[PDB]
Design an enzyme around this catalytic site. Structure first.
Site, mmCIF file in Angstrom:
data_model
loop_
_atom_site.group_PDB
_atom_site.id
_atom_site.type_symbol
_atom_site.label_atom_id
_atom_site.label_comp_id
_atom_site.label_asym_id
_atom_site.label_seq_id
_atom_site.Cartn_x
_atom_site.Cartn_y
_atom_site.Cartn_z
ATOM 1 N N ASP A 1 -7.863 -4.136 -3.725
ATOM 2 C CA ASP A 1 -8.780 -3.102 -3.245
ATOM 3 C C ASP A 1 -8.317 -1.728 -3.753
ATOM 4 N N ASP B 1 0.815 -1.221 0.000
ATOM 5 C CA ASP B 1 0.000 0.000 0.000
ATOM 6 C C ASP B 1 0.850 1.274 0.000
ATOM 7 N N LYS C 1 -11.341 -5.011 -7.217
ATOM 8 C CA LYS C 1 -12.285 -3.890 -7.229
ATOM 9 C C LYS C 1 -12.057 -3.091 -8.511
#
Lengths: 93, 103, 317, 202, 174
Positions: free
Chosen positions: D96, D55, D136
RNA sequence: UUGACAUUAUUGUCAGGUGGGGAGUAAAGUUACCACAGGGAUAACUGGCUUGUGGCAGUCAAGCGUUCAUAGCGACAUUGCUCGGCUCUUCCUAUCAUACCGAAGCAGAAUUCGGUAA
């Protein structure tokens, strides 16, 4: 950043720094509440003031930290040049 | 009814209240380290509380761990002549920390 | 040079000179890198799976399904499960409360590993404070005959009456006594178990009160007390076990070696079952000991345990 | 008692897709700014799973979960998976991906549709044979283009948007179970320059 | 330590006949280990026969506990049943109730049993008869007086009680 | 109920432990651990409210203490760790911008603090 650093926000001498941040929280926030109000509005009043002074000091401190050149990350000439003109250990202290 | 006074809770919190059916104590009001000063040598050592001993005003508060002015508390001397107990001097509901003086 | 290291223990660890000097003499600098450098590990997380309520092979699945890293210890018993990484509460899991397992140290296993309880017989006791070991008494037993439980503390019986009923032993006469006047109470002919009424008290990672507050006066009267408790243990029977959690000689292999001479009815058999290093002969100007070879030893750095000694006795007449 | 509301829409996707996360050992987690994907990758995968998170935000570590906190598009962070995941290849690869929404929606969906291909090129590099790739992705002009390149690089490509989503948001959770793992990969295919080449006029 | 009178056993056996049915005959007649029970300082203790026979040498102040404690006699003259009985009780249970894996920890903190757990309970249960709570592995959790019958508790709103908590194994954290 | 002795498992003695179980010279105290039903006692009125600098302990220390520093209080400092939101009208200044100023290593540009200012 690059070669020179004139563009730094000024450094208040810690007594005046208090007189800037604390006076701003007196002027910019609401200041008048009765004891006869609801407890919820009394809570929210003083919470708003503690937080706003929090953001006050942090804003002034962040300006100093981001403003000054990161001595050991700039350039070998400048890392050592500032080390000669100023006590590099104390500059990092 | 919930308590709006600052308390210390021991480390056996997970299923401790046998006799405290609905006595809500929020996590914000739990101060773990009292800002204790030494009398004989004017040095202040910020040390963790071990046990709440004797709170005046209420013997309920002794069993709840309430830290109102005059409470005798136990102080951890892991960091280190010393006295193990300290009496609190401030009202932590009003100011920030718990301020105690050793005996 | 020795005094350099004595300045690098009493200042580096913040340690007592009385213990730093008495636990370095006739011990190698290698052994100084074993014992002293092991008081930061602080009890590796083993567990005692109660064989009464569930077998271990049916308890390996139970914790792993809740995400607990488990691995058995060396050779002794599959009962001992080393916990590495768990997020599920380490005392509040429904299986703790059921009585499927009790949370123990690795040193808590072996004084009752050495003892061999059989069917229908009685086991007597003097000082079992938590009751974690009396569990291993009344589980190998499979709830038959009699099991005595005892300690000389009214406050600490609550851990016993908690653990016995928690793990479901059914055959426990848990009663507070003075341990010296014990043969006058009953004196049951079958075997006894004694463990750690000690002033030497090894592994300071557990209790750092040892680090600062142990003088000579503890070594005068507490070794004398546990010395008399042997003289009550040999007047109960029949396989006596007396152990302690101390590496210092004035607790084990000076206390047991007294009672060896003091009664001719005393025989020292091979104590432990799997592994554990050989015992000494000379203890800094001490007696002949070719009979005291079998009383096992354990170190905090040779194996991931907490340093202790076991002595298993036999009585004839 | 999880971290975000994004946690309740993969535990819902496992039950619909045969509990694929239950059987899986190693997982590469992308774009997880909260740990609403590694927490549920801990309660599904077996003990000592060894799951790795990537991330852009720098934040805390979680127990039992290794997580590297830096860039996604650089070669150095690709050398941080090359730093770790060369010996083992990932069973699953999660995504995500979500930008900082609130600019035109045309670009808020196209920087998403751009991000999924870069997550794909980190996935096509580091995935086991016949694994999966959950993503996603926003419904947009260039969604039908992404489902096609999924269709020719995977076995079965199925879109969902499960319950416990917003119901107003234009989300799709598309799974791509079964991975080809070719020896000859088409280089002009995977690059975003040729992917979003628009269809000619009628 | 003392032996119970004629009435004092009847008070215990009735309370034990609240959870176990007429299967209390399993509890006293064994012939191998007949399991007699005694009390010390007004609190009954369930043990093997000989293990209480040889422990008649212990002083009353020196004694703390003896095997399995059922419960204590109240000052008024009733009989409470403590959680420690469950190891003897659940092995001979009559009316048995299970719970959710999700709705387990609410029960383990002292709350009652909600209707939000639906499956296969015991049948033929009266409204105010003693039930035993199980939690995969059939793990005994505690006691309970039922709130309603089996019939009434099926057509209910999920936040209504089905079994009033009496004692749970979460008491082992004290 | 345990040991010692003898019978050389069984039985006896002695010694050790329990022993309102029987013979002789029951129930009661307590309760701010307190949980449920009942009786009392009031709660919740700007007595100019409210704002920016914490608290505890010590270091000074203007004086006052009934004389007065050794009946004690003691300011500013200092040293110890640490229910939300749509829309309009009017008003307030504790002003973000626009107007004019003062201080600032303020070369210029840009800026920071401050003053008047609704």
């Amino acid at each position: 950043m690059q070669l020179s650093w004139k563009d730094i926000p000024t450094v208040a001498p810690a007594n005046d720094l208090l007189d800037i941040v604390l006076n701003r929280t007196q002027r910019k926030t609401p200041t008048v509440i009765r004891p006869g109000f609801k407890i919820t509005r009394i809570r929210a009043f003083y919470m708003r003031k503690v937080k706003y002074t929090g953001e006050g000091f942090v804003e002034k401190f962040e300006d100093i930290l981001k403003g000054f050149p990161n001595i050991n990350d700039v350039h070998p000439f400048h890392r050592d040049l500032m080390d000669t003109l100023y006590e590099k250990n104390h500059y990092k202290i | 009814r919930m308590i709006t006074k600052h308390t210390f809770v021991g480390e056996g919190f997970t299923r401790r209240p046998v006799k405290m059916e609905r006595i809500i104590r929020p996590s914000a009001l739990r101060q773990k380290k009292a800002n204790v000063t030494h009398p004989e040598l004017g040095v202040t050592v910020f040390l963790p509380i071990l046990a709440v001993k004797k709170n005046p005003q209420s013997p309920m508060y002794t069993q709840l761990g309430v830290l109102t002015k005059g409470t005798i508390i136990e102080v951890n001397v892991s960091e280190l002549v010393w006295g193990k107990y300290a009496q609190v001097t401030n009202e932590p509901d009003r100011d920030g920390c718990v301020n105690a003086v050793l005996l | 040079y020795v005094d350099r290291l004595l300045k690098d223990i009493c200042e580096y660890f913040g340690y007592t000179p009385f213990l730093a000097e008495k636990l370095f003499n006739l011990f190698s600098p290698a052994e100084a890198m074993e014992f002293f450098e092991a008081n930061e590990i602080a009890r590796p997380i083993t567990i005692r799976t109660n064989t009464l309520k569930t077998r271990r092979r049916d308890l390996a699945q139970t914790l792993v399904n809740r995400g607990v890293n488990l691995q058995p210890i060396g050779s002794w018993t599959k009962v001992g499960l080393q916990i590495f990484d768990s997020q599920v509460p380490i005392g509040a899991t429904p299986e703790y409360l059921a009585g499927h397992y009790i949370l123990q140290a690795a040193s808590s296993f072996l004084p009752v590993i050495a003892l061999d309880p059989h069917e229908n017989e009685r086991i007597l006791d003097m000082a079992a404070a938590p009751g974690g070991k009396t569990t291993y008494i009344s589980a190998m037993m499979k709830n038959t005959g009699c099991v005595f439980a005892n300690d000389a503390n009214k406050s600490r019986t609550k851990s016993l009456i908690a653990n016995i009923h928690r793990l479901g032993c059914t055959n426990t006469i848990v009663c507070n006594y003075d341990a010296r006047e014990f043969p006058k109470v009953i004196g049951g002919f079958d075997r006894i178990l004694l463990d750690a009424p000690c002033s030497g008290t090894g592994v300071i990672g557990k209790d750092q009160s040892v680090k600062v507050s142990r003088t000579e006066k503890d070594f005068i009267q507490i070794p004398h007390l546990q010395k008399q408790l042997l003289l009550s243990a040999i007047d109960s029977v029949g396989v006596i076990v007396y152990s302690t959690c101390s590496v210092a000689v004035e607790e084990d292999e000076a206390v047991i070696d007294y009672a060896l001479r003091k009664r001719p009815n005393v025989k020292l058999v091979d104590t432990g079952l799997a592994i554990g290093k050989e015992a000494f002969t000379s203890y800094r100007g001490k007696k002949f000991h070719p009979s005291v070879k079998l009383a096992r030893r354990y170190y905090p750095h040779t194996y991931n345990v907490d340093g202790f000694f076991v002595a298993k006795f036999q009585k004839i007449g | 008692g999880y971290r975000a509301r994004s946690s309740f829409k993969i535990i819902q996707i496992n039950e619909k897709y045969g509990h694929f996360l239950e059987k899986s050992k190693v997982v590469i987690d992308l774009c997880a700014a909260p740990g609403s994907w590694c927490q549920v990758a801990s309660k599904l995968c077996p003990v000592n799973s060894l799951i790795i998170g990537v991330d852009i935000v720098p934040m805390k570590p979680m127990p039992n979960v290794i997580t590297f906190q830096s860039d996604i598009t650089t070669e150095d962070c690709r050398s941080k998976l090359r730093g770790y995941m060369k010996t083992w290849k990932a069973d699953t690869v999660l995504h995500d991906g979500a930008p900082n929404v609130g600019l035109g929606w045309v670009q808020d969906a196209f920087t998403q549709s751009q991000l999924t291909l870069q997550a794909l090129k980190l996935a096509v590099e580091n995935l086991v044979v016949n694994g999966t790739f959950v993503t996603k992705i926003f419904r947009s002009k260039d969604y039908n283009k992404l489902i096609w390149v999924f269709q020719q690089l995977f076995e079965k490509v199925e879109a969902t948007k499960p319950p416990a989503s917003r119901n107003v948001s234009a989300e799709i959770f598309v799974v791509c179970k079964g991975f080809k793992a070719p020896k000859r990969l088409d280089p002009r295919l995977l690059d975003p320059k040729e992917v979003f080449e628009e269809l000619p006029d009628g | 330590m003392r032996q119970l009178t004629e009435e004092e056993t009847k008070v215990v056996f009735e309370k034990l006949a609240g959870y176990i049915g007429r299967n209390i005959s399993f509890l006293v007649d064994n012939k191998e280990l007949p399991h007699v029970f005694r009390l010390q300082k007004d609190r009954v203790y369930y043990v093997p026969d000989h293990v209480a026979k040889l422990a008649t040498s212990v002083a009353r102040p020196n004694l703390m506990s003896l095997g399995i404690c059922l419960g204590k006699f109240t000052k008024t003259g009733k009989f409470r049943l403590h959680i420690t009985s469950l190891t003897v009780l659940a092995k001979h249970a009559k009316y048995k109730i299970w719970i959710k894996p999700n709705g387990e920890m609410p029960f383990l903190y002292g709350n009652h049993v909600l209707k939000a757990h639906v499956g296969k309970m015991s049948d033929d249960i009266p409204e105010h008869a003693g039930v035993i709570v199980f939690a995969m592995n059939d793990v005994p959790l505690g006691f309970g007086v039922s709130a309603k019958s089996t019939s009434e508790s099926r057509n209910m709103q999920p936040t209504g009680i089905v079994a009033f908590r009496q004692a749970d194994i979460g008491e082992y954290l004290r």
